[PDB]
Design a protein around this ligand. Structure first.
Ligand SMILES: CCCCCCCCCCCCCCCC
Ligand SMILES: CCCCCCCCCCCC
Lengths: 43, 19, 381, 616, 182, 59, 54
């Protein structure tokens, strides 16, 4: 009975970043910011 | 009625061929 | 040569729609169950052709898509081959050597033995041939022989297609009646061409039809007809189903008219929604070699009264007797019965014809309702 | 579209490695599963493809597999080519040692041993959960092959002791019920039912006894026995499980309403100007009024047609149909009153400009037809009909004119009552598309008319033999049993003799496409007695791989010089009494269509012809 | 001059009778048009939009100007508008019979001497056995009986009569569910 | 931004619908026999599912 | 009536014999695996079933 479950922290971080950028009425920065964050994950 | 029918047919054919 | 009224009636058939492409079920779904919907099939055709072109160009994704399509097509073809082999084995198992026989055509009641000549029409089932064979029945036949004279062949194909995508729809029909005295040969062919699809543009279709008739001993003359029709949707709106057609008829002895009587006709067809009225109109003009005839048909519907059907017809001879006809149809359900009425009004002859058909399946109440002709019938000596 | 095609590129999968895939064998093998993936060797891929493949593999194989992981490893750093590895982890049991099957009394011990030997686990530790499913599948397959659908594996026990035991639970028929329903007729497009033969009789005919296994053939036989009654319209049988071994069989039956009525009405109004006048509308045309009553079973269809109202005595039409399907065990009796018109060719043959004449027969015929064996038919008919002759327009013609008499009365219209017997026996069989055997056909027409028909006796006998060609060696289709149509020689003999006084309408003749090829109907002769002999050679083209067959026929028709004996000597009038011998060669295409070129030695004229239907 | 804002399926059903009868509503000197040149045999070129709209064709692989091996024909559900079939006429009357190969009975699925149905390999084995032990070339019962007219007069007379009566009551030609599906 | 394939999504939606049907059937066959409010025929299943207003409107 | 009447009847009787054979084989199918009787219909039902699809 091994039922896998994954630790989804990066997904939550991206969602929170999107929410924070939405609350500031700066959605045009979204694709600028989130992408950079993803690069920070890679290296 | 002949002239109107001929003109309408010619115009419709030209419009269909243009596109 | 038939009168211009016949040609004007032929041209003013109504709103038309040419036949589209045919699609395989195994390849389209990549081995999965699919449903039916137009626009998603011609899209698959043109899309796979474009992806083949791009893969030839060098795009890796197009190559991957085409490879997947090829794998699915090969699997489907092998599955169909295996199914055919299994079906043949099962047919051999059921009947060891006896080929399947076909039911003879039932002509009807007569004073001759009804079971006679049944053996003549009972033949072994033919193979999976492309052509389709139908027998033709004449009006009056020999008293002591079967009344079936002549034959008609029907064929359909979609050639110039690669892997079941694309092609040119093509239909053929040939009626042949050959005896020791007479000869009747009537041929007809249809060809379809598609220019664009909704995803890649508008719906542009062109249909070319050619029909020839030969009656050797009686007429000793042949007749040729060639018509080209172009259909496009949304010409003046979201959807109008605009169509324009041109026909040429010739009665020459052979090939070119060679001074034979020619006739040229042109037709226009369109449907439009204005307010509560969805009107479909088809108007044509024909000129023979020098009278000119005009014809127009219209279908009009009212959404508040969907049960009523209204059709209008207007035919004008050469200048100039104008014939106008109006037909109304209605239906209702009576007590255990259904009654359908039709009213036809013609102003040229100032005549009105009313027809009421009745069907009852529960009891014979309508039979007891109508008993006047029994009293009306008198011996009168 | 393959691996060697694109050796170099970027982000291209090189190899697909599958590890951890269970080797039970019920599931598709490793290569079969590889062939059904989105990622392909030598093709570009992205993370979306991996996610879709993982989700699809998890969904489609949920039960067996607990988790599938897809990983990518660089074959070389600079090449950017990668290898994709799939790892499967299925659900497992901590320990399984032996397998056993309990119950399943009907299953013999041999199958019990076989299924146990089939599913032996290799290792007693960490056994996957596929073994129990395999055992269940094998048992269900065996029982379904045996024909019992409700014999199913109950569940599994013995897991505490590590003994995978499958307890098979069988089922038996317990309760049988019947319901009576009647469907109504309306245009709502949603049928409504009203709930209401003896029920005990239905149960007895079905023969569903309690405490018995249920079989599909049993259901088919019960349905056949219940539907043997002609009164019933629709039947339905359903063996539903009782909420476990009890099976409740529900039977639903609906009868047929025989009454049917069709009415028509036509109106015509002379509008002129303004509102029309209805005072003169005493009556209106009623078209055809059809009344049908199916009810044992006795078909009864009356159709009376009036051309116009206020005067039904003119242009009236009547047709009556009666049929009794269950009057006799192997025979059916029908009676039809109707009219029929057909042109006559024997009376007015062309070979000249002789105008044809149209015979019209209107009357009643009552006949009984029986199908004995499979290919034997016996028909006995008594018919009384008014026979008239009309040429072109509907005008009675006294006699034929280019003059031979048209009928026996001489007025062009008479009434005849006669008896007709038809006997057909057929041993002909189609093997590999070619027919062999024998066929006899006898027709007798006796005019018991003593009322202008008079005494007449017409006898026609036709014998056709399709025999294997003596010269041709035996084909492989007979010995090897398997794919060749034997060569055939067809010998046909037709003899027709007439005695007494017979009118020109029913006079025997000679000619026509069927009787003798190459002749128009009536060209040869019109004599009371005749003899037609046909010899044909038919060879299939399967040896050359070409569809159709090739045949050659020679036919000879002799009137025995009876044209002079015929009343009026019609053959002398049209000056074509010569006996004929026609020979021709033809090809029969797919089906029954034949295209043959035939030459007649009487005039030395050869002609092509195409015909539909078998030659004999 | 106002459009019916509220539309219902029953309105479409009512209009469908008019749609179906518009084909016969066309009346002229020759009534139905599209006749041949000098013969009464009507041409197949009746490309009415209503008729051609619910037309679906398939390119079936029938193998056993280029060769064009594939064959175009109708298959599966013919109508473009799909509707749920009425739950009736499911049961069918069938008579048990013997296969030409051997004593193997054949009612629906073929059954061997035992209770189990015949397998794929068993059919080939029986065929090989009958090839090895062929006999009775001609003196045997005739399989594939030559059907004659009036055969199954009960079936030809009363089978599926209620469906025809229901169709005569409806005269709609489209059951309605296909419209919702599309 | 990498979404699931629409075909899989629709298939799983249909499977979830039939699973919901099975769950409703089990809940009915387990709890629907009891009576909570005899005046309105309120069974235990609807009461414990929070659908009391459904019964109130149905009456 | 001296020749046609017996001959065809013979074939009919022949067919009947073959029919019986089939049922015998069906009995064997019911004999094995302990299956119950297939409750074959009577000849009165059979000749009526001739008019049916059978
Ligand atoms: C007169 C010359 C031919 C005689 C034989 C004709 C019939 C041959 C067999 C059929
Ligand atoms: C190949 C260019 C696309 C348009 C072709 C139109 C041909 C038909 C026009 C003349 C007939 C009315």
């Amino acid at each position: 009975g091994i039922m896998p479950r994954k630790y989804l922290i990066e997904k939550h971080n991206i969602k929170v970043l999107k929410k924070k950028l939405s609350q500031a009425y700066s959605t045009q920065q979204l694709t600028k910011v989130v992408q950079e964050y993803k690069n920070l994950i890679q290296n | 009625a002949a002239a109107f029918a001929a003109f309408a047919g010619f115009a419709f054919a030209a419009f269909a061929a243009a596109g | 040569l038939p009168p211009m009224t016949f040609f004007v009636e032929q041209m003013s058939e109504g709103v038309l729609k040419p036949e589209g492409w045919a699609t395989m079920e195994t390849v389209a779904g990549l081995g999965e169950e699919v449903t039916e919907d137009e626009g998603a099939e011609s899209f698959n055709h043109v899309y796979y052709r474009q992806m083949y072109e791009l893969a030839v160009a060098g795009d890796p994704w197009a190559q991957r898509e085409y490879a997947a399509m090829l794998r699915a097509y090969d699997k489907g073809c092998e599955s169909y081959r295996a199914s055919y082999e299994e079906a043949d084995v099962d047919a051999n198992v059921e009947y060891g050597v006896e080929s399947y026989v076909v039911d003879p055509i039932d002509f009807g009641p007569s004073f001759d033995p009804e079971d006679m000549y049944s053996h003549r029409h009972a033949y072994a089932e033919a193979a999976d041939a492309g052509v389709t064979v139908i027998p033709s029945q004449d009006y009056y036949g020999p008293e002591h022989d079967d009344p079936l004279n002549g034959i008609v062949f029907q064929y359909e194909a979609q050639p110039f297609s690669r892997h079941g995508w694309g092609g040119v729809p093509f239909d053929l029909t040939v009626c042949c009646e050959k005896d020791k005295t007479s000869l009747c040969l009537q041929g007809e062919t249809h060809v379809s061409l598609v220019h664009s699809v909704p995803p890649f543009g508008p719906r542009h279709i062109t249909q070319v039809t050619g029909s020839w008739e030969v009656l050797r001993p009686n007429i000793k003359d042949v007749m040729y007809q060639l018509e080209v029709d172009t259909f496009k949707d949304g010409l003046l709106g979201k959807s109008d189903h605009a169509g324009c057609g041109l026909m040429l008829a010739r009665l020459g002895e052979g090939g070119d008219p060679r001074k034979g009587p020619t006739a040229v006709g042109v037709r226009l067809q369109d449907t439009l929604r204005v307010g509560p009225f969805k009107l479909e109109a088809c108007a044509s003009k024909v000129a023979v070699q020098k009278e000119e005839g005009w014809g127009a048909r219209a279908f009009v519907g009212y959404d508040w009264l969907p049960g009523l059907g209204m059709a209008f017809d207007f035919i004008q001879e050469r200048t100039r007797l104008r014939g106008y006809g109006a037909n109304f149809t209605y239906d209702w359900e009576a007590l255990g019965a259904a009654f359908g009425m039709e009213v036809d009004y013609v102003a040229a002859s100032e005549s009105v014809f009313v027809s009421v058909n009745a069907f009852s399946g529960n009891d014979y109440r309508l039979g007891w309702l109508l008993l006047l002709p029994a009293v009306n019938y008198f011996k009168e000596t | 579209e393959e691996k060697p095609g694109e050796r170099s590129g970027t982000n291209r999968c090189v190899e697909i490695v599958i590890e951890g895939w269970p080797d039970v064998g019920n599931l598709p093998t490793a290569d079969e599963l590889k062939d059904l993936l989105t990622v392909q060797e030598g093709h570009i891929f992205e993370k979306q493809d991996l996610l879709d493949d993982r989700r699809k593999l998890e969904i489609q194989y949920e039960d067996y597999i607990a988790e599938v992981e897809i990983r990518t490893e660089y074959v070389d750093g600079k090449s950017n080519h990668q290898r994709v590895v799939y790892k499967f982890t299925p659900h497992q049991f901590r320990g399984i040692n032996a397998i056993d099957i309990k119950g399943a009394a009907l299953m013999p011990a041999s199958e019990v041993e076989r299924i146990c030997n089939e599913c032996l686990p290799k290792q007693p530790y960490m056994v996957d959960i596929a073994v129990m499913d395999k055992v269940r599948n094998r048992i269900e397959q065996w029982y379904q092959s045996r024909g019992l659908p409700f014999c199913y594996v109950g569940f599994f026990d013995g897991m505490d002791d590590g003994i995978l035991r499958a307890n098979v639970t069988e089922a038996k028929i317990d309760n049988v019920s019947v319901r009576f329903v009647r469907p109504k007729l309306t245009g709502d497009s949603e049928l409504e039912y009203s709930v209401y033969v003896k029920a005990d009789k239905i149960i007895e005919a079905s023969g569903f006894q309690r405490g018995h296994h249920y079989h599909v053939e049993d259901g088919y036989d019960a349905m056949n026995s219940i539907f043997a009654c002609g009164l019933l319209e629709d039947i339905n049988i359903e063996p539903e499980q009782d909420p476990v071994n009890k099976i409740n069989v529900k039977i639903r039956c609906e009868e047929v309403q025989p009454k049917s009525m069709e009415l028509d009405l036509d109106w015509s109004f002379q509008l002129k100007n303004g509102i029309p006048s209805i005072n003169r509308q005493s009556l209106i045309p009623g078209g055809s009024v059809e009344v049908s009553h199916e009810n044992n079973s006795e078909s009864a269809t009356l159709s009376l047609s009036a051309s116009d109202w206020r005067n039904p005595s003119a242009d009236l039409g009547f047709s009556v149909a009666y049929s009794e399907p269950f009057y006799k065990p192997h025979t059916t009796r029908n009676a039809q009153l109707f009219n029929t018109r057909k042109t006559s060719t024997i009376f007015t043959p062309g070979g000249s400009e002789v105008p044809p004449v149209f015979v019209d027969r209107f009357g009643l015929k009552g006949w009984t037809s029986q199908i004995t064996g499979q290919d034997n038919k016996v028909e006995h008919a008594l018919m009384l009909q008014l026979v008239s002759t009309l040429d072109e327009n509907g005008q009675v013609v006294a006699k034929g004119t280019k003059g031979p008499p048209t009928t026996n009365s001489g007025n062009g219209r008479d009434l005849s009552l006669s008896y007709q017997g038809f006997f057909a026996l057929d041993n002909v069989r189609f093997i590999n598309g070619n027919q062999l055997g024998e066929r006899m056909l006898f027709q007798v027409d006796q005019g018991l008319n003593p009322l202008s028909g008079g005494i007449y006796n017409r006898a026609t006998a036709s014998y056709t033999k399709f025999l294997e060609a003596p010269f041709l060696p035996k084909l492989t289709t007979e010995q090897l049993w398997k794919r060749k149509a034997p060569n055939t020689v067809v010998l046909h003999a037709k003899a027709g003799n007439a005695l007494g006084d017979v009118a020109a309408y029913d006079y025997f003749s000679l000619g026509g496409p069927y009787s003798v090829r190459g002749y128009s109907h009536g060209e040869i002769g019109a004599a009371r007695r005749f003899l037609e002999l046909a010899t044909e050679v038919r060879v299939p083209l399967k040896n050359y791989g070409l569809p159709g067959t090739a045949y050659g026929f020679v036919e000879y028709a002799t009137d025995l010089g009876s044209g002079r004996e015929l009343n009026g000597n019609p053959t002398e009038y049209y000056r074509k009494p010569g006996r004929g011998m026609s020979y021709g060669l033809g090809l029969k295409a797919l089906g029954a269509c034949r295209f043959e070129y035939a030459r007649d030695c009487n005039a030395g004229t050869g002609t092509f012809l195409v015909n539909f239907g078998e030659r004999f | 001059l106002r459009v019916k804002t509220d539309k219902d399926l029953q309105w479409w059903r009512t209009k469908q009778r008019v749609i179906t009868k518009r084909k016969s509503a066309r009346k002229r000197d020759r009534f139905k048009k599209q006749i041949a040149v000098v013969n009464k045999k009507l041409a197949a070129l009746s490309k009415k939009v209503e008729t051609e709209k619910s037309n679906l064709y398939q390119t079936l692989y029938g193998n056993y100007f280029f060769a064009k091996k594939l064959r175009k024909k109708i298959s599966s559900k013919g109508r473009r508008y799909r509707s749920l079939s009425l739950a009736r006429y499911l049961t069918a009357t069938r008579k048990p019979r013997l296969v030409g190969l051997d004593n193997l009975t054949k009612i629906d699925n073929i059954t061997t001497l035992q209770g189990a149905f015949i397998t794929k390999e068993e059919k080939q084995d029986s065929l090989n056995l009958t090839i090895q032990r062929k006999q009775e070339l001609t003196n045997s019962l005739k399989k594939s009986q030559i059907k004659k007219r009036s055969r199954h007069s009960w079936k030809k007379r009363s089978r599926h009569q209620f469906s025809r009566n229901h169709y005569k009551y409806r005269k709609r030609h489209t059951h309605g569910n296909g419209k919702l599906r599309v | 931004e990498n979404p699931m394939d629409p075909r899989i999504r629709e298939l799983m939606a249909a499977e979830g619908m039939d699973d919901k049907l099975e769950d409703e059937g089990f809940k009915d066959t387990v709890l629907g026999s009891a009576i909570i409010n005899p005046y309105t025929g309120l069974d235990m299943k609807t009461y414990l599912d929070g659908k009391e207003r459904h019964q109130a409107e149905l009456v | 009536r001296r020749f046609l009447h017996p001959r065809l009847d013979d074939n009919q009787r022949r067919v009947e014999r073959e029919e019986e054979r089939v049922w015998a084989l069906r009995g064997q199918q019911r004999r094995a695996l302990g299956l119950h009787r297939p409750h074959r219909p009577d000849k009165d039902a059979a000749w009526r079933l001739e008019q049916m699809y059978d």
